Amino acid sequence: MVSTAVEKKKYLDSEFLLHCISAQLLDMWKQARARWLELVGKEWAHMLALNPERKDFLWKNQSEMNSAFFDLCEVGKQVMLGLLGKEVALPKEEQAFWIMYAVHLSAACAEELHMPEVAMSLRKLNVKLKDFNFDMPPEEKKRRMERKQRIEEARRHGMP
């Protein structure tokens, strides 16, 4: 499953997504991907400055990067639903998608941020994904619910 998803990592490239999801959702995906990678790259550059030999990325649980990753997962899930043309995926479809998502983002860290391949591992991403798929204030809960609604609406070409 992870073997086939390695080639299928290109499936989340903008050029492969184009015309298969709405223009609005595609732009949300492009922006959310860029935002997360930029934050990862900043955090890494600081870490590397302090230990040039390090090979691990420490994921800070209370960080802008972490919040940006959550939002990227939210957009990613709607990308999946957009590709399938469904509101609720089969669990096998979800498992396939999240594998492709994790392979895609891990490749981007090695290829686009030039991080050691072992730093942003498939396993690390999966730990955080499990959190997404399974002490936040009430106002921030509201915020995330309104954002998810806006992404869902983008996916449906502006429809509820």
Side-chain angles (χ1 to χ4, degrees):
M1 277 197 77
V2 183
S3 287
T4 44
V6 174
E7 198 291 307
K8 311 263 184 167
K9 82 181 178 59
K10 307 276 266 202
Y11 280 46
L12 295 174
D13 289 349
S14 292
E15 73 204 291
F16 275 85
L17 286 178
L18 187 63
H19 306 313
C20 299
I21 59 175
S22 73
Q24 187 178 8
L25 181 59
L26 180 57
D27 199 69
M28 287 174 165
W29 169 258
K30 290 174 159 181
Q31 300 207 16
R33 183 188 191 276
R35 178 186 175 215
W36 181 71
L37 288 168
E38 182 165 324
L39 293 160
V40 172
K42 286 176 185 293
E43 284 190 337
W44 178 244
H46 281 292
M47 291 169 188
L48 206 57
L50 299 179
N51 183 3
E53 289 73 51
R54 82 179 283 164
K55 297 300 164 205
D56 68 277
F57 177 90
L58 179 149
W59 188 300
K60 302 177 213 168
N61 276 3
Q62 286 196 108
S63 72
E64 181 82 351
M65 182 280 283
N66 188 73
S67 293
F69 181 72
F70 186 93
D71 190 61
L72 183 57
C73 290
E74 205 78 88
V75 181
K77 185 175 189 193
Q78 302 302 315
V79 168
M80 176 192 68
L81 294 176
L83 296 173
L84 290 170
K86 297 177 187 196
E87 295 292 330
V88 177
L90 293 167
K92 66 186 296 179
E93 290 171 326
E94 293 186 303
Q95 176 171 235
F97 180 84
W98 293 121
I99 289 166
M100 298 179 45
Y101 177 89
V103 168
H104 178 88
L105 295 181
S106 184
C109 286
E111 294 171 7
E112 300 172 28
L113 298 180
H114 307 111
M115 293 172 56
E117 282 192 304
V118 300
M120 190 67 75
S121 67
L122 278 50
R123 179 180 192 275
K124 192 172 285 288
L125 286 163
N126 284 332
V127 172
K128 294 290 174 297
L129 270 171
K130 280 183 176 171
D131 292 343
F132 172 77
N133 286 315
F134 307 126
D135 278 44
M136 188 176 58
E139 65 272 2
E140 175 65 4
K141 172 182 167 187
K142 203 182 227 299
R143 196 67 55 193
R144 300 284 178 165
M145 173 215 79
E146 296 165 352
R147 166 66 167 169
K148 181 179 187 179
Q149 290 175 233
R150 290 191 296 278
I151 304 163
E152 290 174 333
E153 288 165 350
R155 167 181 46 91
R156 304 195 201 96
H157 299 262
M159 307 288 197

Short mmCIF file of all heavy atoms in Angstrom, two decimals, residues 1 6 26 28 47 63 87 92 97 105 126:
data_model
loop_
_atom_site.label_atom_id
_atom_site.label_comp_id
_atom_site.label_asym_id
_atom_site.label_seq_id
_atom_site.Cartn_x
_atom_site.Cartn_y
_atom_site.Cartn_z
N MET A 1 0.83 -1.25 0.00
CA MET A 1 0.00 0.00 0.00
C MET A 1 0.85 1.27 0.00
O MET A 1 0.56 2.20 -0.75
CB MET A 1 -0.94 0.03 1.20
CG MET A 1 -2.24 -0.76 1.01
SD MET A 1 -3.60 -0.24 2.33
CE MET A 1 -4.16 1.44 1.55
N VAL A 6 3.87 5.63 -3.16
CA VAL A 6 5.13 6.36 -3.44
C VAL A 6 5.17 6.97 -4.85
O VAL A 6 5.58 8.13 -5.01
CB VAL A 6 6.39 5.48 -3.17
CG1 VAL A 6 7.66 6.21 -3.61
CG2 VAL A 6 6.48 5.12 -1.70
N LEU A 26 -8.71 23.67 -5.01
CA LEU A 26 -7.34 23.51 -5.48
C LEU A 26 -6.45 24.66 -4.97
O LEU A 26 -5.33 24.43 -4.52
CB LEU A 26 -7.26 23.42 -7.01
CG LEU A 26 -5.82 23.25 -7.55
CD1 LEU A 26 -5.07 21.98 -6.98
CD2 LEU A 26 -5.86 23.27 -9.08
N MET A 28 -7.01 26.47 -2.25
CA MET A 28 -6.85 26.26 -0.81
C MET A 28 -5.76 25.21 -0.51
O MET A 28 -4.99 25.35 0.43
CB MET A 28 -8.17 25.80 -0.18
CG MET A 28 -9.18 26.92 -0.06
SD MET A 28 -10.88 26.22 0.55
CE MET A 28 -11.69 27.94 1.05
N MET A 47 16.78 24.87 13.97
CA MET A 47 17.32 23.66 14.58
C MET A 47 18.68 23.26 14.02
O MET A 47 19.61 22.92 14.78
CB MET A 47 16.32 22.49 14.42
CG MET A 47 15.10 22.70 15.25
SD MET A 47 13.74 21.33 14.71
CE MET A 47 12.34 22.11 15.77
N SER A 63 2.53 25.11 18.20
CA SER A 63 3.27 25.94 17.25
C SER A 63 2.36 26.34 16.11
O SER A 63 1.34 25.66 15.84
CB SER A 63 4.52 25.20 16.73
OG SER A 63 4.21 24.12 15.82
N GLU A 87 -19.47 12.50 -0.07
CA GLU A 87 -19.38 13.15 1.25
C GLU A 87 -18.72 12.27 2.29
O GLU A 87 -18.16 12.78 3.26
CB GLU A 87 -20.78 13.55 1.73
CG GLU A 87 -21.49 14.62 0.89
CD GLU A 87 -20.83 15.97 0.98
OE1 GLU A 87 -20.23 16.30 2.03
OE2 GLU A 87 -20.92 16.72 0.00
N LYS A 92 -11.38 1.97 3.17
CA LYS A 92 -10.22 1.60 2.34
C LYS A 92 -9.76 2.77 1.48
O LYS A 92 -8.57 2.90 1.20
CB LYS A 92 -10.49 0.36 1.45
CG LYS A 92 -11.55 0.56 0.37
CD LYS A 92 -11.89 -0.72 -0.38
CE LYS A 92 -10.69 -1.27 -1.16
NZ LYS A 92 -11.02 -2.51 -1.86
N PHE A 97 -5.80 7.17 0.77
CA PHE A 97 -5.55 8.58 0.62
C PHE A 97 -4.54 9.09 1.64
O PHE A 97 -3.61 9.81 1.28
CB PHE A 97 -6.84 9.39 0.74
CG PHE A 97 -6.60 10.85 0.60
CD1 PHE A 97 -6.52 11.43 -0.67
CD2 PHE A 97 -6.36 11.65 1.70
CE1 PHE A 97 -6.28 12.76 -0.82
CE2 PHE A 97 -6.07 12.99 1.54
CZ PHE A 97 -6.04 13.54 0.30
N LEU A 105 3.81 14.52 1.45
CA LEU A 105 4.39 15.55 2.33
C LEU A 105 5.82 15.20 2.79
O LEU A 105 6.68 16.09 2.88
CB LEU A 105 3.47 15.85 3.51
CG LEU A 105 2.12 16.47 3.17
CD1 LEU A 105 1.29 16.74 4.47
CD2 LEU A 105 2.28 17.74 2.30
N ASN A 126 2.12 10.16 10.33
CA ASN A 126 1.01 9.28 10.73
C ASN A 126 0.57 9.49 12.18
O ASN A 126 -0.63 9.43 12.46
CB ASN A 126 1.38 7.83 10.46
CG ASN A 126 1.28 7.46 8.98
OD1 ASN A 126 0.50 8.05 8.24
ND2 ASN A 126 2.06 6.48 8.55
#
